[PDB]
Amino acid sequence: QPEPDMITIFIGTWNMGNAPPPKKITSWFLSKGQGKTRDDSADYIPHDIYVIGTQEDPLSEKEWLEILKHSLQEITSVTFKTVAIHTLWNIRIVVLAKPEHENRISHICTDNVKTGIANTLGNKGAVGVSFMFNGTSLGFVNSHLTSGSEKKLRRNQNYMNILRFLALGDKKLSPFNITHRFTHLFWFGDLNYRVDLPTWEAETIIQKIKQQQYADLLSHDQLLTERREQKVFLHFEEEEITFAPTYRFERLTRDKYAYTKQKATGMKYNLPSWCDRVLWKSYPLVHVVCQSYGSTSDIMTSDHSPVFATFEAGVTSQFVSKNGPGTVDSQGQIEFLRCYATLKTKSQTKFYLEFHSSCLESFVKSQEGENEEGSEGELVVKFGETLPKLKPIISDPEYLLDQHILISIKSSDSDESYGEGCIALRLEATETQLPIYTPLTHHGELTGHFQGEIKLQTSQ
Numbered sequence: 195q196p197e198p199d200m201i202t203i204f205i206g207t208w209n210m211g212n213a214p215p216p217k218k219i220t221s222w223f224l225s226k227g228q229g230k231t232r233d234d235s236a237d238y239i240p241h242d243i244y245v246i247g248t249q250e251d252p253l254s255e256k257e258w259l260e261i262l263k264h265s266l267q268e269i270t271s272v273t274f275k276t277v278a279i280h281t282l283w284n285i286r287i288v289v290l291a292k293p294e295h296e297n298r299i300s301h302i303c304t305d306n307v308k309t310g311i312a313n314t315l316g317n318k319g320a321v322g323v324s325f326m327f328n329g330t331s332l333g334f335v336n337s338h339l340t341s342g343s344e345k346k347l348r349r350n351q352n353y354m355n356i357l358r359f360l361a362l363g364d365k366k367l368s369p370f371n372i373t374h375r376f377t378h379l380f381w382f383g384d385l386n387y388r389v390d391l392p393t394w395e396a397e398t399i400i401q402k403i404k405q406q407q408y409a410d411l412l413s414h415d416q417l418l419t420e421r422r423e424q425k426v427f428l429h430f431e432e433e434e435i436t437f438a439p440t441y442r443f444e445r446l447t448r449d450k451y452a453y454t455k456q457k458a459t460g461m462k463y464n465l466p467s468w469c470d471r472v473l474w475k476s477y478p479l480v481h482v483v484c485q486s487y488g489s490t491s492d493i494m495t496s497d498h499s500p501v502f503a504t505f506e507a508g509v510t511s512q513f514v515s516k517n518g519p520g521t522v523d524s525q526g527q528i529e530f531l532r533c534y535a536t537l538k539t540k541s542q543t544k545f546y547l548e549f550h551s552s553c554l555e556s557f558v559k560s561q562e563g564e565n566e567e568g569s570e571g572e573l574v575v576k577f578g579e580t581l582p583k584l585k586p587i588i589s590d591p592e593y594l595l596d597q598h599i600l601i602s603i604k605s606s607d608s609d610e611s612y613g614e615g616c617i618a619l620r621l622e623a624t625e626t627q628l629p630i631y632t633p634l635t636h637h638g639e640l641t642g643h644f645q646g647e648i649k650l651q652t653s654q
């Protein structure tokens with residue numbers, strides 16, 4: 195039985211509006227409705243992993259697992275295994291996998307973050323799950339962010355709190371938040387970003403939706419506009435949206451958007467919006483292709499429609515050689531030439547680097563770099579040819595070229611990371627000096643850059 199080099203992942207997000215689901219929700223798992231939909235010829239082909247995020251979920255874990263497993267069984271005739279389930283208030287994540295994957299999945303982690311203080315702490319936040327699938331780390335975040343058209347900044351703040359404080363993945367990666375811990379990170383939920391147009395334009399918006407003319411609406415979608423101004427979700431991707439706004443519907447039909455202010459909305463308008471979203475971030479030069487992104491048309495118990503997205507994701511095998519794991523492979527080395535960090539910090543401390551990778555027995559600390567002043571005000575930290583030679587556990591190029599090196603630049607004075615990034619070893623050549631580059635972030639905000647050259651030696 196060969197180990198896979200690709201899997202398919204289903205991501206679902208549904209705000210259930212505190213109502214039980216209808217008797218049939220199979221269209222969700224089949225990626226059928228509006229948008230980028232899945233070919234009918236694939237309907238019986240199970241995805242490898244199904245990750246279901248709900249918000250305003252009124253069901254017990256048991257009740258929802260029942261419905262999910264029986265839905266997938268009906269579609270695929272496969273009885274899925276429960277990998278993980280985690281609930282914060284009415285925010286829930288379920289991970290199901292094909293039974294053949296049970297012994298490929300390990301290191302399962304779950305966590306939650308509650309957003310806001312006092313007033314604003316009590317129902318919003320995120321749940322998440324991570325695990326290893328053979329040699330590949332996978333993370334999944336389901337967030338329900340702050341509601342309301344005039345709270346996009348609160349949503350951005352909720353995002354930064356979730357990525358700082360959600361404790362998933364390898365705890366040995368101590369300088370790195372969830373946006374660097376995983377080969378593939380999927381972040382979905384009722385993100386609650388709105389179409390920012392005047393209230394008086396509600397009927398115009400509805401008209402545009404009926405004509406399937408989304409362009410003048412997406413140009414005002416707060417998540418796209420905040421992303422474009424680097425205010426949120428820096429270095430995440432989203433597939434093009436080709437489905438109608440998924441909020442706010444009258445229940446039991448999809449023929450009507452309910453946008454007018456009511457006591458029940460706190461006298462707020464809910465103009466039709468793409469509240470319900472799926473984004474991802476994968477390490478550089480790893481295969482990840484979105485194969486569906488849309489909304490169902492036939493599930494109408496909630497004022498939201500379910501959203502689906504599916505992905506092809508590259509995975510690697512759990513590599514064993516004669517040497518590592520348990521020792522180094524002298525035939526392998528990673529060298530860095532002419533490297534420097536460019537930092538936005540106004541501070542003057544010395545900096546050193548940390549290299550972290552599962553291709554190393556443990557993380558590697560560099561000597562301090564030499565600070566110089568950039569021509570436009572910047573701090574430039576020069577490492578020249580001074581960076582250590584990294585000694586991987588396995589030299590086989592079929593392993594080593596699939597790996598990644600996480601870099602943290604840390605203050606000598608405080609040992610706090612000022613910036614984190616990631617370098618792919620999927621090089622055009624071995625034994626050859628080649629440019630490398632990563633942006634550096636801290637709390638998911640841009641803090642600088644790291645660039646230089648790499649020289650990778652493999653056994654070939």
Ligand SMILES: CN(C)C(=O)OCCn1ccnc1
Nearest residue numbers: 417418419421422423430431
């Ligand atoms: C879509 N959007 C909000 C945006 O900023 O796209 C340009 C940057 N980009 C290019 C590939 N991925 C992100």
